[PDB]
């Protein structure tokens, strides 16, 4: 899995052409060492792949990977601002205030470009992540039709579109920490859904994606909420270790190889 | 007056003394047991209960809903599992220093 | 003038900035009038035309004060018989005179090289007599490079010799002149400037190494002479007072950096290697009742190293015999 | 809300200057009660070193308070100063008397200065120093004060000088809101005299130098929030120096080290902090209210705890720098008391609960809400019971996926370091801007 | 008014407690001894010439610093000495944009 | 808490520190020992006023926000050249010179 002008140039086929599917078998391994022997890669081609490559993760319903992916893209230092960063930090609050309900904090070798330009240029997405601490879907609807001119003028549009159904979702496992097994009509204050006609529907989109765990009680009028119940004991939970285990002895000894590379040149 | 202040502590040092030989072969004792063997009230049962947890003398866990002295024998791992989250933390902090010198 | 770069030209100032600078050198007087306009002069020069001329002032003024000192070293070498009471005015009028220079010329060292000798090490420039350049440093630096020169000529076995005649004599008293004996003292301490190491080299081969040897051998033909003529009675005296007037006359002629240095090669000469008759003395004193000669042995005994617990074991076994003989 | 009953004697001669007019003045706008006697004791003290700008002040209070028919004092003062007592009012003759009056003293001791100067002592040099120090603070120089006090710092020759004056700089610099720097001059103000000098002020002790140090740096981590550093030094200070001439009262030092350990420790700590060390043991005697809470609290006795909490209160409310922290301090004790009393507990029943604080059914669903988000334990509310369960997960589910989300990103990150390094060895540096 | 006043006190000294700066528009700055110690060329000028440091006549010429030049020096020297070896509040030194530029020139030449 | 104040008269000024509200006949007593000048034959000025003896600077003018040490204030000196006051005005300073425009 090397990388390459050629595998940049790739993910920008599939931006146009939507079909995710030739950029899985490229994308599902990690890659390193680039190809280098006269000279093949540019500085763009590393901030235009990491910003392409996040797109695919995002819709694809994989946002471990595409945390990882947009965070490259800001961490690399510059002297001046330019689009890619631009667009990289905008969708950095947005996928992060789905899987938490904050934004992550910055490295210490991150560009300062990031925090003193871009920083006071992003306010929009900024307060965003305000308002999602305190867990009101009234006041994020307020948000959106304020601040819409900024996501059209940013090509940004349908990725602030998953985080209005994500604070609903976000409601349901809190009550879940806090709660036990709630009534029907209870659950469609706090969430505010309108009804308990739309609290039995919503519960059922978590059940079919994995996001949470729980059992309608009809015959009471209420539902339960109760934990996984795994302990990790099945045989295919050591597999997956020995397996992961696999590519971290490999890690080590490509970078045995690299180190005495440095060490045979010159150095001060 | 001097000796008078004091006559309360000692007399809730003995229950304490009792109540470690009598837990240990009961393994779910009921809270009435313990009230009906000392010939006191229940009462002051339910508040010398939670001093004795507290204090980290009687282990277990009080339901008032049930009346019963839980005690799992066979409880999940404490000792071996608080050390595997220090090391994910301290692991965590490091990797972040290692990859910031070098921009 | 004016604080913004002006026109000032270079040969319209030299004519009159060497004749306040010679006017002042050498412990001499000169108008408060013309003192207070040399300091408008310089920064009104440097600043003007578009070269700067701090590079050839700094030059200029090296070669002039390369001839004044080396012209003023024969006027002291006709003299003779009177080198060690020359070389004192010599020193104290180049004190005086340096210190009023680098004070005036305090903004060409902060602007112009600002750098010192801490980052140079050249042992060519500085010994000998050189009237080529001179290494990049400060004027009150430079001073001290120039003075160096004057000891390595054929003149340090005159000077020094008959500077540490005066202080061997201790048999009359303190003191005979303190004004010429401490005025060449201070010469070699304050000459000492800044380089890549310890500047403990120069001074320690110009001062400190004819010193030890001429000391240690005056008090070790004085010692062993008084011994074997006086008595004990009258040996614990004479070396007592002896001993006592060296570190009052070291204190108001060398410097604190080399106290307990010369201290330490003169107690090696009097009570040393004569260990032996010393300590066989000591045991028919404490045998009686003396406060007198007792006194005489602890004193001698508490400035040499390691030699408190060798009395403090001769007394123990003293009394420890005394008791048991009465018993 | 307000108290009736407080002692206005000890609270006025406590401090001294504005400290004294503003806290007379906090006390008449809060209690309706306490207000012809607030007023009066503070009009009082212009009188000693007459000024102009808290002269003016003062009686802009007393007339919305008299002439007013919308507040309950009206029957009484009946809209004039004729009631009873006879304040200070104020007239035209009477606001060019108090100003002419204040500039001849400062003349005065002006010129006393420029002779003390002359005379090359510097005995008298320190000495006028604090006359004019407090001279200028009851005018209305705020910035003439610190200019007195700063000069007398090179006139100091013994220990003594130097506590007398870092202690007059904290006064100013608590007008200012200047919290870094009292912190930075109580360790200078321990160092000079080795803590309560070099034997211990003789045998016997009438004035502790130590409880002074102690005192002035608790009033200014309290106001800036810092309840964890100031309940760490009350409990070293002892009851001995007799009140305070311009310093906190020595009743107060006990509640304000009293609450600020009672929600930042548990009932394990307080036995050992307030009532293992002897030093505090004689400031909780003197108030017995305060140290029957860390009896109750040890014995597991949280409802009549609780009630006594409340009951206090009314009284603290009455203060200037306690009142606002009287919804800080207390929400924190209330979540600290309902952690350790789940602690051995972990199937409670919410009828038990609700009997126990004085409470209802519906009150007691609403706490256990903020006791999950908020609190550090782990219930479950069972609304078909009305019993607070506990669902917990498995330890190996929460330790075995937690290492492995590291392991991914720890794998992650050091595969992309290698690409960042890539490229800076073919000389590719940043092109992009 | 009321008050007891000193009559030989306070700052009072001879020629030697003040020194003269003499400006290049026929200004004369009178000012204290030790407000003149802060820069380094007048200081040089005290120290010396001259084997003579006290003589009653001490004096700075100034060629290259008119009037409203030194006028902001006098004053920065009694700044700078008056808010030493003390803890109190320091304002802002009005500066102004035609003389900052000629401020900076002479903060140089003074070494300070 | 003290005060600096500069004595200008016909281009020549004299910086004499004072207390804030000290009397004014002891500031007259510190420039007898600097001009060599009797003090009766001194008259301090405030804004063309005529001061009093009796009086102090803490009275007239004279506090600590107006003769601050970094500006102080201008104090008129009058002489006796037959019986009556010599000085009354005095001159400003120069104008600063023309700005280099490469640097604008």
């Given at each position: 899995?090397?990388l390459?002008?050629?595998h940049?140039?790739l993910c920008?086929?599939?931006?146009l052409?939507k079909?995710?599917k030739p950029?899985?078998?490229?994308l ?6 680039i190809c280098?022997?006269?000279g093949?890669?540019?500085?763009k081609?590393f901030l ?16 471990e990977?595409?945390?990882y992916?947009y965070?490259?893209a ?7 601002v330019?689009?890619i960063?631009l ?6 609050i947005?996928?992060?205030?789905i899987?938490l309900?904050?934004?992550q904090?910055l490295?210490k070798?991150t560009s300062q470009?990031?925090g003193?330009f871009?920083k006071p240029?992003s306010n929009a997405?900024?307060?965003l992540?305000q308002?999602?601490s ?6 994020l ?5 304020k601040?819409?001119?900024?996501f059209?003028?940013?090509?940004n549009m349908?990725?602030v ?11 349901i496992?809190?009550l879940?920490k ?5 009534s029907?009509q209870?659950?469609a ?5 309108s009804?308990?006609?739309?609290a ?6 978590m059940?079919?994606?994995?996001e ?6 009809q015959?009471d ?13 099945n045989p295919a939970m050591?597999?997956?270790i020995?397996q ?6 490999e890690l080590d ?5 690299m180190?005495?590379?440095i060490?045979?040149?010159p150095?001060? | 007056?001097?000796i008078?202040?004091h ?7 003995i229950?304490?003394?009792?109540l470690?030989?009598?837990?240990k072969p009961?393994?779910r ?11 006191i009230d ?13 204090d ?10 049930n ?6 024998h066979q409880?999940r791992?404490?000792?071996?599992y608080?050390?595997?989250?220090k090391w ?9 220093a290692?990859?910031?010198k070098?921009? | 003038?004016?604080?913004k770069?002006?026109?000032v030209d270079?040969?319209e100032?030299?004519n009159?900035?060497?004749?306040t600078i010679?006017?002042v ?5 000169v108008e ?5 306009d040399?300091?408008?002069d310089?920064?009104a020069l ?6 700067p001329?701090?590079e ?7 070669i002039?004060?390369?001839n ?10 006709e003299?003779?018989?009177q080198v060690?009471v ?7 009028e ?6 009023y220079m ?8 902060t ?11 050249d042992?060519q ?6 009237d080529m350049?001179?290494?990049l440093?400060?004027?009150?630096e430079?001073?001290?490079?120039m003075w ?6 054929p003149?340090?076995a005159?000077?020094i010799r008959?500077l540490?005649?005066?202080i061997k ?11 010429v004996?401490?005025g060449?003292?201070?010469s ?5 400037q800044y380089?890549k ?18 000391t240690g051998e ?9 011994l ?11 070396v007592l007072?002896?001993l006592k007037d060296?570190?009052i006359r070291?204190?108001?002629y060398?410097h604190?950096?080399?106290?307990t ?7 090696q ?12 003395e000591c045991?028919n ?5 003396k ?15 390691t030699?408190?617990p060798?009395?403090?074991?001769e007394?123990?076994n003293?009394?420890?015999?005394e ?5 | ?13 406590s ?6 007019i503003e806290?007379?003045?906090f006390?008449?706008?809060h209690?309706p009660?306490?207000?012809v ?7 009082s003290?212009?009188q000693?070193?007459?000024?102009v700008?808290m002269?003016?002040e003062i009686?802009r ?10 507040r309950?004092?009206?029957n009484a003062?009946?809209?004039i ?5 006879e304040?200070?009012?104020?007239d035209?003759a009477?606001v ?12 005065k001791?002006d010129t006393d200065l420029k ?5 090359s ?7 006028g120093?604090?006359?004019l120090?407090?001279?200028?603070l009851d005018?209305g ?9 700063s000069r007398?710092?090179d006139?100091?020759?013994s220990?003594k000088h ?7 700089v904290i006064?100013?610099?608590?007008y200012?809101?200047?919290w870094?720097?009292?912190?930075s001059?109580?360790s ?5 005299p ?5 034997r211990?002020?003789r045998?016997?002790?009438?004035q ?6 102690k005192?002035?740096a ?8 810092k309840?964890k550093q100031?309940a760490?030094?009350l409990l070293?200070?002892?009851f ?7 310093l906190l009262?020595?009743?107060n030092?006990?509640?304000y080290?009293g ?5 930042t ?8 902090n ?15 209210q305060?140290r029957?809470?860390?009896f109750?609290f040890?014995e ?5 705890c609780l ?5 206090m ?6 203060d200037?720098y306690?009142?606002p ?5 207390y ?10 009393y789940?602690?051995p507990?972990?199937?409670?029943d ?8 004085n409470?209802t ?6 706490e256990?809400?903020q006791?999950?988000?908020e609190?550090?334990?782990?219930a479950?509310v069972?609304?078909?019971?009305k019993?607070?369960?506990a ?7 929460t ?5 492995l ?7 992650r ?5 290698m690409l ?6 073919n000389?590719?540096?940043?092109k992009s801007? | ?10 700052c ?5 407690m003040?020194?003269?700066?003499i400006?290049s528009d026929g200004?004369?700055?009178?000012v204290?001894?030790?407000?003149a ?6 200081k ?10 006290e003589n009653?006549?001490?004096?700075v010429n100034?060629?290259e610093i ?7 020096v006098?004053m ?5 000495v008056?808010?030493?070896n003390?803890?109190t509040?320091?304002?802002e030194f009005?500066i ?5 530029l000629?401020?900076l020139?002479?903060?140089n030449?003074?070494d300070? | 808490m ?19 509200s000290?009397?004014?006949?002891e500031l007259?007593?510190i420039?007898?020992?600097i001009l060599?000048?009797p ?7 405030k804004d063309?006023?005529l001061?009093?003896?009796g009086?102090?600077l803490g009275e007239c003018?004279f506090?600590?926000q107006?003769?601050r ?8 000196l ?6 009556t006051?010599?000085?009354?005005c005095?001159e400003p300073?120069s104008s ?6 490469v640097?604008?």
């Amino acid at each position: 899995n090397q990388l390459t002008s050629i595998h940049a140039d790739l993910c920008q086929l599939c931006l146009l052409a939507k079909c995710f599917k030739p950029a899985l078998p490229y994308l599902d391994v990690d890659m390193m060492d680039i190809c280098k022997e006269n000279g093949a890669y540019d500085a763009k081609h590393f901030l235009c792949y990491y910003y392409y490559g996040g797109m695919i993760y995002t819709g694809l319903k994989n946002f471990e990977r595409a945390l990882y992916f947009y965070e490259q893209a800001i961490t690399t230092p510059a002297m001046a601002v330019s689009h890619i960063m631009l667009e990289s930090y905008k969708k950095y609050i947005l996928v992060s205030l789905i899987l938490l309900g904050k934004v992550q904090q910055l490295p210490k070798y991150t560009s300062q470009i990031v925090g003193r330009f871009i920083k006071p240029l992003s306010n929009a997405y900024h307060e965003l992540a305000q308002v999602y601490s305190t867990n009101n879907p009234s006041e994020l609807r307020n948000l959106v039709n304020k601040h819409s001119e900024t996501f059209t003028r940013d090509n940004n549009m349908g990725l602030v579109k998953q985080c209005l159904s994500s604070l609903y979702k976000k409601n349901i496992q809190r009550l879940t920490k806090t709660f036990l097994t709630l009534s029907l009509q209870d659950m469609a204050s706090r969430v505010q859904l309108s009804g308990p006609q739309e609290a039995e529907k919503y519960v059922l989109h978590m059940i079919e994606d994995g996001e949470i765990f729980a059992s309608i009680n009809q015959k009471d009028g209420m539902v339960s909420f109760h934990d996984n119940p795994e302990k990790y004991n099945n045989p295919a939970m050591l597999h997956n270790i020995d397996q992961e285990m696999l590519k971290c002895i490999e890690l080590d000894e490509r970078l045995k190889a690299m180190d005495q590379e440095i060490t045979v040149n010159p150095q001060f | 007056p001097f000796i008078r202040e004091h006559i309360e502590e000692l007399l809730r040092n003995i229950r304490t003394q009792v109540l470690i030989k009598l837990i240990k072969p009961y393994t779910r004792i009921h809270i009435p047991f313990i009230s009906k063997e000392l010939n006191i009230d229940v009462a002051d049962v339910e508040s010398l209960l939670v001093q004795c947890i507290l204090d980290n003398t009687i282990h277990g866990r009080i339901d008032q809903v049930n009346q019963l002295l839980e005690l799992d024998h066979q409880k999940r791992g404490g000792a071996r599992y608080t050390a595997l989250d220090k090391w994910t933390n301290q692991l965590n902090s490091l990797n972040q220093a290692v990859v910031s010198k070098l921009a | 003038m004016s604080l913004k770069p002006r026109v000032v030209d270079f040969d319209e100032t030299w004519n009159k900035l060497l004749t306040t600078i010679k006017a002042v050198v050498m412990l001499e007087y000169v108008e408060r009038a013309t003192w207070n306009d040399r300091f408008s002069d310089i920064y009104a020069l440097c600043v003007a035309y578009p070269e700067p001329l701090g590079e050839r002032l700094y030059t200029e003024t090296k070669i002039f004060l390369e001839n004044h000192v080396r012209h003023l070293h024969k006027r002291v070498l006709e003299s003779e018989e009177q080198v060690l009471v020359m070389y004192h005015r010599y020193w104290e009028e180049y004190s005086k005179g340096a210190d009023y220079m680098d004070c005036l010329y305090r903004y060409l060292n902060t602007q112009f090289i600002k750098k010192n000798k801490l980052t140079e090490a050249d042992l060519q420039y500085g010994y000998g007599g050189v009237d080529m350049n001179e290494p990049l440093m400060e004027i009150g630096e430079l001073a001290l490079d120039m003075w160096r020169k004057l000891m390595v000529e054929p003149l340090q076995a005159i000077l020094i010799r008959m500077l540490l005649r005066e202080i061997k004599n201790d048999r009359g008293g303190e003191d005979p002149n303190q004004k010429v004996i401490h005025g060449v003292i201070n010469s070699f301490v304050h000459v000492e400037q800044y380089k890549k190491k310890f500047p403990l080299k120069f001074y320690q081969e110009i001062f400190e190494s004819p010193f030890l040897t001429e000391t240690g051998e005056y008090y070790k033909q004085e010692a062993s002479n008084l011994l074997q003529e006086s008595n004990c009675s009258q040996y614990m005296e004479k070396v007592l007072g002896r001993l006592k007037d060296e570190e009052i006359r070291c204190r108001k002629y060398l410097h604190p950096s080399s106290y307990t240095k010369v201290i330490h090669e003169c107690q090696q000469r009097m009570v040393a290697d004569h260990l032996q008759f010393l300590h066989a003395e000591c045991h028919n004193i404490i045998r009686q009742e003396k406060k007198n000669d007792m006194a005489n042995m602890y004193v001698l005994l508490r400035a040499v190293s390691t030699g408190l617990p060798h009395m403090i074991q001769e007394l123990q076994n003293h009394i420890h015999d005394e008791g048991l003989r009465a018993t | 809300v307000e108290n009736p009953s407080l002692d206005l004697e000890q609270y006025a001669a406590s401090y001294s200057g504005l400290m004294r007019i503003e806290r007379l003045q906090f006390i008449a706008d809060h209690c309706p009660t306490l207000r012809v006697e607030a007023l009066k004791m503070a009009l009082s003290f212009v009188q000693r070193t007459f000024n102009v700008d808290m002269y003016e002040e003062i009686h802009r209070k007393l007339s919305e308070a008299t002439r007013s028919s919308l507040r309950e004092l009206q029957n009484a003062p009946d809209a004039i100063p004729e009631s009873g007592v006879e304040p200070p009012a104020l007239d035209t003759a009477w606001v060019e008397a108090t100003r002419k009056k204040a500039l001849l003293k400062l003349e005065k001791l002006d010129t006393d200065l420029k002779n003390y100067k002359g005379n090359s002592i510097k005995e008298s040099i320190r000495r006028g120093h604090d006359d004019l120090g407090d001279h200028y603070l009851d005018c209305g120089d705020l910035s003439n004060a610190l200019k007195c006090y700063s000069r007398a710092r090179d006139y100091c020759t013994s220990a003594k000088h130097v506590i007398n004056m870092c202690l007059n700089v904290i006064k100013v610099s608590v007008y200012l809101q200047n919290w870094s720097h009292v912190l930075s001059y109580v360790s200078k103000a321990e160092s000079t005299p080795e803590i309560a000098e070099q034997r211990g002020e003789r045998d016997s002790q009438t004035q502790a130098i130590l409880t002074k140090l102690k005192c002035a740096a608790g009033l200014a981590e309290l106001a800036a929030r810092k309840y964890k550093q100031a309940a760490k030094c009350l409990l070293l200070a002892s009851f001995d120096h007799c009140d305070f001439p311009e310093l906190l009262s020595p009743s107060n030092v006990a509640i304000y080290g009293g609450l600020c350990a009672l929600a930042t420790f548990d009932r394990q700590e307080l036995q050992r902090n307030v009532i293992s060390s002897s030093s505090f043991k004689l400031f909780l005697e003197l108030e017995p209210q305060v140290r029957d809470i860390i009896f109750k609290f040890y014995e597991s006795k949280y409802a009549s705890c609780l009630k006594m909490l409340d009951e206090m209160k009314d009284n603290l409310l009455l203060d200037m720098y306690l009142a606002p922290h009287v919804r800080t301090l207390y929400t924190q004790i209330r979540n600290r008391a309902l952690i350790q009393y789940f602690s051995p507990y972990v199937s409670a029943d919410m009828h038990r609960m609700a009997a126990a604080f004085n409470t209802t059914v519906a009150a007691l669903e609403d706490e256990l809400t903020q006791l999950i988000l908020e609190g550090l334990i782990s219930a479950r509310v069972d609304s078909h019971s009305k019993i607070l369960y506990a669902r917990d997960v498995d330890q190996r589910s929460t330790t075995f996926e937690k290492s492995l989300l590291m392991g991914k990103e720890f794998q992650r990150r050091a595969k992309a370091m290698m690409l960042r390094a890539a490229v800076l060895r073919n000389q590719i540096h940043v092109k992009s801007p | 008014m009321d008050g007891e006043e000193k009559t030989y006190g306070g700052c009072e000294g001879p020629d030697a407690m003040y020194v003269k700066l003499i400006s290049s528009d026929g200004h004369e700055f009178i000012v204290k001894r030790e407000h003149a110690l802060t820069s380094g060329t007048i200081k040089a000028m005290l120290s010396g010439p001259g084997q003579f440091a006290e003589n009653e006549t001490n004096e700075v010429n100034f060629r290259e610093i008119p009037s409203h030049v030194l006028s902001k020096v006098c004053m920065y020297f009694t700044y700078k000495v008056r808010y030493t070896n003390s803890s109190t509040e320091i304002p802002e030194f009005p500066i102004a944009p035609e003389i900052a530029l000629e401020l900076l020139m002479a903060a140089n030449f003074l070494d300070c | 808490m003290d005060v600096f104040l500069m004595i200008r008269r016909h281009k020549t000024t004299i910086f004499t520190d004072a207390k804030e509200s000290s009397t004014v006949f002891e500031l007259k007593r510190i420039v007898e020992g600097i001009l060599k000048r009797p003090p009766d034959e001194q008259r301090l000025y405030k804004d063309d006023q005529l001061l009093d003896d009796g009086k102090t600077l803490g009275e007239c003018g004279f506090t600590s926000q107006t003769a601050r040490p970094q500006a102080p204030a201008t104090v008129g000196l009058a002489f006796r050249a037959d019986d009556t006051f010599e000085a009354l005005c005095i001159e400003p300073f120069s104008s600063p010179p023309e700005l280099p425009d490469v640097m604008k």
